Design a protein around this ligand. Structure first.
Ligand code: IHP
Lengths: 238, 502, 217, 225, 230
C-alpha cells in the first residue's frame, strides 16, 4: 500500500514513517538532558569518542544557533547538522527582517514548520533528529523548547531526548514535582545526576558535554572540562 | 415490546427509541431479523407495524438514516423471505416409521404407547393450527391493504407495503379478492415502481385463476402407422413424420384442425417416444371459452370488468407506451406473461377493446409504442394455444396486416424487440398451428423495399422463429435456402452477415 | 487513493483530542482539551485556540503541525481581504477560502490531505457564526459541534443541552460540560483551553477566567 | 494502440454520416437519432460550419468533437489573418488529423475519438471531401460514410456513384438521401442534410425541403418497379 | 444524488425548484439559500451537490458571465455559459492528470436568441436542453412523473408551479411537503428586464394548500364514484 514506505495516511490514521524517524533518534545511542532553572537553562549530553584517532574537539552535539541561543541535537549526525544550519539561517534572517533577536519559542516553531513539510510531502523523508533549544527570554526568563520529527514543538520545565528519554523523563518528573526553583549549581547537578542515573556511568569530565545560558550572562557558554569536573566532584562529595 | 416503539398512536416515543427499535427489527447481518420471522403470528404483527410507522410522529423521513433503515428492512425482508406453510399434514407412511422408532429397544426409555385419545388430540390441534395460519394470512393481506390506503401515509411506506403484499402471492390459494382488485386497479398507479409491481402480481394472479386443461394419452406408432423401431434411432424417423411441418399437412379447415394431433413442445419424438405421450384433450372436453361474465368467478369478474372498460385499457396502454430508460429498454418478459395470461384465461374477450389501440401503436414508429404492441402480439399468439379454430382464424386476420406493417416499419431502435416478439410467439408451439406467421415472414424477407438494414432485420426476425422450431420444420428451412441462394452474390454487408448467421 | 486518504485523514481527526463549539445569541464559545502528558510540559507555551483576526478564532481536533499550516494561511487570507476592502473579512468568506486550501492538498499528488478538522467562530454584522471544515474541504454551519474522540457521544449530549436562545455565559458552561463527559481525569484551568467570540471580538479566556467558570460548574 | 482502438469503437457507435462530392455542390447528410420525451433537439447538431467555405460532419464522442471543432474554427480564422485566403479543405483536414494525433498530454486518451467527414470548396472552386480518422490518417473521397452502417452505405455508394448521379444538384442531394435512407429508416424525420453549394454559404435544408426530396425518390422507385 | 432539483420550462417562464434537507438538528440554516444561486441578471443555477462543491462551480460560472460582459457589455447568452463550463469539466476528465467534476447542475435563463431555456450538465461535461428535467435524489421517479403530466407548448408558469409541487410531493422524502423544506425560483420577463424571484414562504405555502385541497377533491370524487358503482 506504500503507507509504511512514504508519509501518507494509514487505515488507522497514523503516519508510520514519522514513527520510524523517531526510532532513528534512538539509533545514535546517545541521550541529552535539558533542565530549566529559576535563573538559567542547562543542557547535558553524553559524548562518546569511539576511536583514539578521532579529534575530541570535532565531536559535539551542542551547537550555538545565535549568541544567546544554543541547541542539543539527538539523532543522525548529518541530519542534525542540516537542521542546525537551517536554524542559524532562520535566526539571522529574523534579526535582519525584524531588528530584534528571534525568541527561542519562535525559532522552535520555524524549525517545526519545516519539519511538517517533510511529513506532508512523499519525496522528502522526515529528518531523524530532535532539537532542544535553550535561551533566556527577556520577557519570560529562561526557556527550554524541544522540536520533533513530527513537527510538534513544546516548552518544557525539563526534557530529555535519546535512548534513555523515557527513563530520563521519569527521574526529572519526580524532582520537578517536589523541590523548588533551582540555583545554577542545582540545575547543572539535576541534569548530570539524571544522565548518570539512567546510564549508570559515573561520568568522568571527558564523557559529558555541558551547555548553559544564565539571566546574568544571556550568551550561550559551553563549560570547559575543568568546570564540568568541578560540578562532578561536588556531586561526588554529597 | 419492540413494536410498541414504532406504534403510530404511542406518544413520547422519541427519535432515538424509534431508530433503535428499527435496528432491532432489522436484526444483524447474520442472526434473527425479528421482522421476517417465519411464523405467521410474528409476521402479522411486524409487517403492518412497519407500514404504519409512517404516521408515528417520531419518524423523520427527512433524516437520511431513517430512509436507509426502511429501505434495508424492505430489502432484507425481500431477500430472506420464504413461503410459510399454510398446511402441515403428515402422511400415514411417515407415522408408521415413527411408531417403530418409538417401539425400539436399546437406548430406550420405558414409555406408554400413545393412547387413541391422545392421537386424536394431535390431529385436532394440527387442523386448528393450519386453520389459524390461514386466518392470519387473510388478516396480513387485509391489514397491509388498510395500511397502504391510509389517508396521510408517506409515499415510501405505501411502496414498502405494496412490496410486502406482493410477497404474499401464495400459489396454493388464489389471492383474497380485495387484493386482486387493488393490484388490477394499481396497474395504472401514477408511480412506475408501483405499476411494475402490479404487472408482476397480476400475471401471477392470472396463473392462480387459470383453469386446468385435460390431456389425452396417445400412441405415436398408431397415429404415424409406423412400427416404432426398438433400437434408439434418433433424428427424423417414420414414426416422427406427422410432427414435421408440411404445406399439405397444414389443416386449413375446421374439421382438419380438430383431427390434427398438435404435439406442441419441440423436444418430443426426436430421440425416443415417452412411455406415456399426451397430446391435449379434444376442444369439447377443454374448459369452455367465451364465458358471458355471469359464469366467471368473482376474482375473474374483477379482472374482466377492469380490462373490459375502455378507459382502463386506454390508460394502461398510455402507461405501457411511456419510455422508462432511453436505449436501455427491452422486451420485459413479465409484460408478456400478463398478456399471455389475459388472453389464455379470457379467450380474446378484450380483443375488441384492445383492437383500436393495437392499430395505432403499430402505425407509430416510436421505439416505445412499437415495444408495447410487440409484447401484446407475443402474448396474443401464445395465449391462442387453447383457442377454438374460429377464434384463432379471427386473431390471424387482424394480426397478419399489423405484423406486416410492423415488419415494414422495423428500425434500429425496435428491431431487437420485434425479434423477441417473434421468438417468444414461436417458442413451445406446434409449427403447423403457427403457419400464418411462418408464411408472413417468409414471403419476401429480402424484398429491398425497406432498403438494406431493414432487409437484415426482417431476415433476423425470421431466423429467430425458425430457430425456436427445431427439426419440426424440414420445409421452410429448405424454402429459405432456395430463396437465399440466388441473392447470395447480390447482398450488401449488413445483409451478408445476417445471411451467414441464418 | 485520494478518497481513501481523506477517510484515513478523518480517522486521525477522530483520534484527536476532543474540541467543542457552541453558538449562542450573543456569542460563540470554542472549547478544547489540552492535557499535557507530563508535569514537565509547560502549559502556557503552546495554545490550541488561536485568533485569526480580531473577530475570528479557530480550534481543531487532529494533528497540530497540520493545524499550524492552516492558521498561517487563514491569517494571511484575512489580511489580504482587509487590504483590498478595508473591512474585517466575513467569517463565511474566510471558511470558504480556508476550505479551498484543504481541497488543493487532497487533489494534488505526492501530498497527503491535512489530518485536522477546523472549528471556526466569527462575529460579523451583529450575528454569531460557527463553522466546521473537513480534511476533504467540505464546510458546514453548526449551532453546536463536537470533534475528536467521543465526538458522536458529545454531539448527542449537545442536542439535549442546546437551546435556541442561550446566553454566551450559559453556552460556556455547557461547552465545559461536554468536555467533562469525555475528560479522563480532573479538569483544571491549565487542562482546558476556552475561547469566546462576542461583539467585542475573539478572545482566549485567561486561565483565571476559566478557573471561575469551572468553579461555578 | 489500445486508445486508438477504443476511439474507433466510439466512432462505429456514432450516427451515420454520408457525404458526396458533386460538380457544383458538396452534400453532407447525417442521421438524427431520437433524444428523449422532454429533451430539446436544438442542442444536438452533428453538422458544423468550420468556416464559410468548409463544413464538417462528425461521428464519435460529442465532447471530443466540440474541442476539435472549436480548435479548427479558430485555425480557419488564423489562416485567413496570416495568408488572406480561405482555408483549403485539405489544410483544415490536416490540422484536425494532427490535433487527433496529439491531445496535448502524454497518454490521456491522445486520439480525440471522432471520425470526421470534411466537405467544402477550395478558393479555386474545386469541390473536396476528406475523411479524418482517430489514427490521424486523412484521405480524400468522391463519396464516403462514417458511423453505424458505414461499410454497407459505402458499397451502395460505390454502385450508385456515377457521372449521371452527380450531373445535377438535385440528383447529388438525392444520392446522399438514398444512401442515408438505407442505414436510417424513416422519411425526413430522422435525416439532417446540408448543401454547401458553390461560392454560397452552407445551407441546412428545412425538414419540409428534405421530405420533398424523399418523396421524389419514392416516386422514382415506384416508376422503376 | 445529494438533493432533488427540478426544472420546468413554461411559455411565460422557467422555474427551478430544489429540496432543502436538514441532515442534523444542530446544522444551521445559513446554507438555506441552497440552490437558485444567480449566475447573472438573466441566469440562475441549481447544483446537485454539497455546498462546498457548489461554491467552486458557481463562482467559476459567475466569472465566465462577467468576462463576457466586460468584452461585449451585453449579458452572456445562456447556451454559451453552459458550454464554457462543460469544456472545463471535459478537460479535467479528458486529461490524465485531473479528476472529473462530480456535480450535475441545472440552469434556467432567458436570452434574446432562444428565449427562456432550461439546461442540464452531467459530471461528464455533456449538456442537454430540456423542456423539464430532474437531478438529485429520486430523479428517476420525477422524470417519469414529468413525462406523464408535462404538456409541451401548453404549460403556463402557474401550471408549471402546480406540476412542480405535485412531482416534488411524490419524489422528495419530506413525508409532508412544507414551505420550509422546498425552495422555488421563477424566471420571467417583465417589461424589458428578466426578473428572477424566489417565491416567498407564504406564496409557496399557498401552492401546497391548493395542491392538498385539489388532492382531497380527487379523493372525494373517487369515493363517490365507488359508491355510485356499488
Ligand atoms: O403442464 P403445466 O405444468 O400446467 O404447464 C404447461 C407447460 O409447463 P411445463 O412444460 O413446465 O409443465 C408449458 O411450458 P412452460 O413455458 O410453462 O414451461 C406451458 O407454457 P407455454 O404456454 O409457454 O407453452 C403452459 O404453462 P402456462 O400456460 O401456465 O405458462 C402449460 O400449462 P397448461 O397445461 O395450463 O397449458
Amino acid at each position: 500500500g506504500f503507507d509504511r514506505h512514504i508519509t501518507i495516511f494509514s487505515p488507522e490514521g497514523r503516519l508510520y514513517q514519522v514513527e520510524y524517524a523517531f526510532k532513528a533518534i534512538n539509533q545514535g545511542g546517545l541521550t541529552s538532558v535539558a533542565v530549566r532553572g529559576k535563573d538559567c537553562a542547562v543542557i547535558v549530553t553524553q559524548k562518546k569518542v569511539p576511536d583514539k584517532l578521532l579529534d575530541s574537539s570535532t565531536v559535539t552535539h551542542l551547537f550555538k544557533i545565535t549568541e544567546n541561543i544554543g541547541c542539543v541535537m539527538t539523532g543522525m549526525t548529518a541530519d542534525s547538522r542540516s537542521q542546525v544550519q537551517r536554524a542559524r539561517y532562520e535566526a539571522a534572517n529574523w534579526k535582519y527582517k525584524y531588528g530584534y533577536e528571534i525568541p527561542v519559542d519562535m525559532l522552535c516553531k520555524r524549525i517545526a514548520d519545516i519539519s511538517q513539510v517533510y511529513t506532508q510531502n512523499a519525496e522528502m523523508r522526515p529528518l531523524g533528529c530532535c532539537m532542544i533549544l535553550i535561551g533566556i527570554d527577556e520577557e519570560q526568563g529562561p526557556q527550554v523548547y524541544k522540536c520533533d520529527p513530527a513537527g510538534y514543538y513544546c516548552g518544557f520545565k525539563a526534557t530529555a531526548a535519546g535512548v534513555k528519554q523515557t527513563e530520563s523523563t521519569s527521574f526529572l518528573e519526580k524532582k520537578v514535582k517536589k523541590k523548588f526553583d533551582w540555583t545554577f549549581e542545582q540545575t547543572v547537578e539535576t541534569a548530570i545526576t539524571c544522565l548518570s542515573t539512567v546510564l549508570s556511568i559515573d561520568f568522568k569530565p571527558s564523557e559529558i558535554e555541558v551547555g548553559v545560558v544564565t539571566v546574568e550572562n544571556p550568551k550561550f557558554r559551553i563549560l570547559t572540562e575543568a568546570e564540568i569536573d568541578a560540578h562532578l566532584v561536588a556531586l561526588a562529595e554529597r | 415490546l419492540v413494536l410498541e416503539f414504532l406504534r403510530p398512536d404511542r406518544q413520547g416515543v422519541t427519535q432515538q427509541q424509534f431508530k433503535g427499535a428499527l435496528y432491532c427489527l432489522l436484526g444483524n447481518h447474520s442472526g434473527v431479523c425479528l421482522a421476517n420471522l417465519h411464523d405467521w403470528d410474528c409476521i402479522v404483527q411486524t409487517w403492518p407495524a412497519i407500514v404504519s410507522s409512517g404516521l408515528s410522529q417520531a419518524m423523520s423521513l427527512e433524516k437520511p438514516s431513517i430512509v436507509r433503515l426502511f429501505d434495508d428492512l424492505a430489502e432484507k425482508i425481500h431477500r430472506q423471505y420464504e413461503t410459510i406453510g399454510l398446511d402441515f399434514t403428515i402422511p400415514k407412511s411417515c407415522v408408521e416409521i415413527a411408531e417403530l422408532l418409538q417401539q425400539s429397544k436399546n437406548p430406550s426409555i420405558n414409555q406408554i404407547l400413545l393412547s387413541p385419545e391422545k392421537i386424536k388430540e394431535g390431529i385436532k390441534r394440527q387442523q386448528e393450527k393450519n386453520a389459524d395460519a390461514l386466518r392470519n394470512y387473510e388478516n396480513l393481506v387485509d391489514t397491509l391493504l388498510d395500511g397502504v390506503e391510509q389517508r396521510n401515509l408517506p409515499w415510501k411506506f405505501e411502496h414498502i407495503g405494496i412490496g410486502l403484499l406482493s410477497l404474499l402471492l401464495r400459489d396454493d390459494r388464489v389471492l383474497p379478492l380485495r387484493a386482486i382488485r387493488f393490484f388490477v386497479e394499481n396497474l395504472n398507479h401514477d408511480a412506475i415502481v408501483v405499476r411494475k409491481m402490479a404487472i408482476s402480481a397480476v400475471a401471477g394472479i392470472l396463473k392462480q385463476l387459470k383453469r386446468t386443461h385435460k390431456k389425452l394419452t396417445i400412441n405415436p406408432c398408431e397415429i404415424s402407422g409406423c412400427p416404432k423401431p426398438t433400437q434408439l434411432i434418433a433424428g427424423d424417423r417414420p414414426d416422427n413424420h406427422w410432427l414435421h411441418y408440411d404445406s399439405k399437412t397444414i389443416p386449413r379447415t375446421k374439421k382438419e384442425w380438430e383431427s390434427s394431433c398438435f404435439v406442441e413442445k419441440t423436444h418430443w419424438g426426436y430421440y425416443t417416444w415417452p412411455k406415456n405421450m399426451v397430446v391435449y384433450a379434444g376442444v369439447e372436453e377443454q374448459p369452455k371459452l367465451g364465458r358471458s361474465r355471469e359464469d366467471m368467478t368473482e376474482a375473474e369478474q374483477i379482472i374482466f370488468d377492469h380490462f373490459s372498460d375502455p378507459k382502463f385499457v386506454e390508460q394502461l396502454i398510455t402507461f405501457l407506451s411511456l419510455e422508462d430508460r432511453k436505449g436501455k429498454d427491452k422486451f420485459n418478459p413479465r409484460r408478456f406473461c400478463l398478456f399471455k395470461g389475459i388472453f389464455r384465461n379470457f379467450d380474446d374477450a378484450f380483443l375488441p377493446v384492445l383492437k383500436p389501440h393495437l392499430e395505432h401503436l403499430v402505425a407509430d414508429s416510436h421505439e416505445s409504442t412499437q415495444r408495447c404492441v410487440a409484447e401484446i402480439i407475443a402474448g396474443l399468439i401464445r395465449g391462442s394455444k387453447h383457442w377454438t379454430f374460429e377464434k384463432v382464424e379471427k386473431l390471424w386476420e387482424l394480426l397478419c396486416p399489423l405484423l406486416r406493417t410492423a415488419l415494414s416499419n422495423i428500425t434500429v431502435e425496435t428491431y431487437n424487440d420485434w425479434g423477441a416478439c417473434i421468438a417468444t410467439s414461436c417458442e413451445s408451439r406446434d409449427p403447423r398451428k403457427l403457419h400464418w406467421l411462418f408464411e408472413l415472414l417468409l414471403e419476401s424477407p429480402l424484398s429491398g423495399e425497406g432498403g438494406s438494414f431493414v432487409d437484415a432485420c426482417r431476415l433476423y426476425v425470421l431466423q429467430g422463429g425458425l430457430a425456436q422450431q427445431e427439426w419440426r420444420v424440414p420445409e421452410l428451412l429448405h424454402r429459405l435456402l432456395k430463396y437465399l441462394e440466388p441473392k447470395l452474390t447480390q447482398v450488401y454487408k449488413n445483409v451478408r452477415e445476417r445471411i451467414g448467421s441464418v | 487513493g485520494k478518497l481513501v486518504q481523506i477517510e484515513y485523514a478523518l480517522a486521525a481527526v477522530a483520534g484527536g483530542a476532543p474540541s467543542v463549539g457552541i453558538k449562542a445569541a450573543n456569542g460563540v464559545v470554542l472549547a478544547t482539551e489540552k492535557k499535557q502528558k507530563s508535569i514537565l510540559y509547560d502549559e502556557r507555551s503552546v495554545h490550541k485556540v488561536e485568533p485569526i483576526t480580531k473577530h475570528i478564532g479557530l480550534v481543531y481536533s487532529g494533528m497540530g503541525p497540520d493545524y499550524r499550516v492552516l492558521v498561517h494561511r487563514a491569517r494571511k487570507l484575512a489580511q489580504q481581504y482587509y487590504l483590498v476592502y478595508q473591512e474585517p473579512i466575513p467569517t463565511a468568506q474566510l471558511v470558504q477560502r480556508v476550505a479551498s486550501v484543504m481541497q488543493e492538498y487532497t487533489q494534488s499528488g505526492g501530498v497527503r490531505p491535512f489530518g485536522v478538522s477546523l472549528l471556526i467562530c466569527g462575529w460579523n454584522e451583529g450575528r454569531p457564526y460557527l463553522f466546521q471544515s473537513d480534511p476533504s474541504g467540505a464546510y458546514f454551519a453548526w449551532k453546536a459541534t463536537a470533534m475528536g474522540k467521543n465526538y458522536v457521544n458529545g454531539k448527542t449530549f449537545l442536542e439535549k443541552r442546546y437551546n435556541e436562545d442561550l446566553e454566551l455565559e450559559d453556552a460556556i458552561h455547557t461547552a465545559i460540560l461536554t468536555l467533562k463527559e469525555s475528560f479522563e481525569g480532573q479538569m483544571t484551568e491549565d487542562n482546558i483551553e476556552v475561547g469566546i467570540c462576542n461583539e467585542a471580538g475573539f478572545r482566549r479566556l485567561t486561565p483565571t477566567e476559566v478557573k471561575d467558570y469551572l468553579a461555578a460548574i | 494502440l489500445f486508445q486508438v482502438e477504443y476511439a474507433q469503437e466510439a466512432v462505429k457507435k456514432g450516427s451515420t454520416a454520408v457525404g458526396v462530392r458533386g460538380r457544383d455542390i458538396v452534400v453532407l447528410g447525417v442521421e438524427k437519432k431520437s433524444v428523449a420525451k422532454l429533451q430539446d433537439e436544438r442542442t444536438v447538431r452533428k453538422i458544423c460550419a468550420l468556416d464559410d467555405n468548409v463544413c464538417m460532419a462528425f461521428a464519435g464522442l460529442t465532447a471530443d468533437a466540440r474541442i476539435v471543432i472549436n480548435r479548427a474554427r479558430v485555425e480557419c480564422q488564423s489562416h485567413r489573418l496570416t495568408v488572406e485566403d480561405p482555408v483549403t479543405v485539405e489544410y483544415i483536414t490536416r490540422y484536425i488529423a494532427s490535433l487527433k494525433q496529439r491531445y496535448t498530454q502524454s497518454n490521456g486518451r491522445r486520439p480525440f475519438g471522432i471520425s470526421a467527414l470534411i466537405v467544402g470548396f477550395d478558393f479555386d472552386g474545386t469541390p473536396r471531401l476528406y475523411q479524418t480518422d482517430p489514427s490521424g490518417t486523412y484521405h480524400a473521397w468522391k463519396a464516403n460514410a462514417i458511423g453505424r452502417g458505414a461499410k454497407s452505405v459505402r458499397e451502395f455508394l460505390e454502385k450508385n456513384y456515377t457521372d449521371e448521379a452527380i450531373e445535377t444538384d438535385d440528383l447529388t442531394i438525392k444520392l446522399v438521401i438514398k444512401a442515408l435512407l438505407e442505414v436510417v429508416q424513416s422519411g425526413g424525420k430522422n435525416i439532417e442534410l446540408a448543401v454547401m453549394r458553390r461560392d454560397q454559404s452552407l445551407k441546412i435544408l428545412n425538414p419540409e425541403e428534405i421530405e420533398k426530396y424523399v418523396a421524389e425518390i419514392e416516386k422514382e422507385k415506384e416508376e422503376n418497379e | 444524488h445529494a438533493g432533488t432539483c427540478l426544472g420546468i420550462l413554461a411559455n411565460d417562464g422557467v422555474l427551478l425548484a430544489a429540496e432543502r434537507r436538514n441532515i442534523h438538528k444542530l446544522l444551521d440554516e445559513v446554507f438555506f439559500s441552497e440552490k437558485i444561486y444567480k449566475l447573472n441578471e438573466d441566469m440562475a443555477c441549481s447544483v446537485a451537490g454539497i455546498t462546498s462543491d457548489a461554491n467552486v462551480l458557481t463562482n467559476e460560472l459567475r466569472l465566465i458571465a462577467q468576462r463576457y460582459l466586460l468584452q461585449y457589455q451585453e449579458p452572456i447568452p445562456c447556451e454559451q455559459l453552459v458550454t464554457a463550463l462543460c469544456d472545463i469539466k471535459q478537460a479535467y476528465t479528458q486529461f490524465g492528470g485531473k479528476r472529473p467534476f462530480g456535480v450535475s447542475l441545472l440552469y434556467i435563463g432567458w436570452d434574446k436568441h432562444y428565449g427562456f431555456q432550461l439546461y442540464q450538465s452531467d459530471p461528464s461535461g455533456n449538456y442537454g436542453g430540456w423542456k423539464a428535467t430532474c437531478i438529485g435524489n429520486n430523479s428517476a421517479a420525477a422524470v417519469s412523473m414529468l413525462k406523464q403530466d408535462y404538456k409541451e407548448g401548453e404549460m403556463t408558469l402557474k401550471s408549471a408551479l402546480a406540476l412542480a409541487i405535485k412531482v416534488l410531493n411524490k419524489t422528495m422524502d419530506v413525508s409532508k411537503l412544507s414551505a420550509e423544506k422546498v425552495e422555488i425560483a421563477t424566471l420571467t420577463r417583465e417589461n424589458g428586464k428578466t426578473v428572477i424571484r424566489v417565491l416567498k414562504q407564504k406564496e409557496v405555502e399557498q401552492l401546497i394548500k391548493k395542491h392538498e385541497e385539489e388532492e382531497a377533491k380527487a379523493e372525494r370524487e373517487k369515493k363517490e364514484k365507488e359508491q355510485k358503482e356499488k
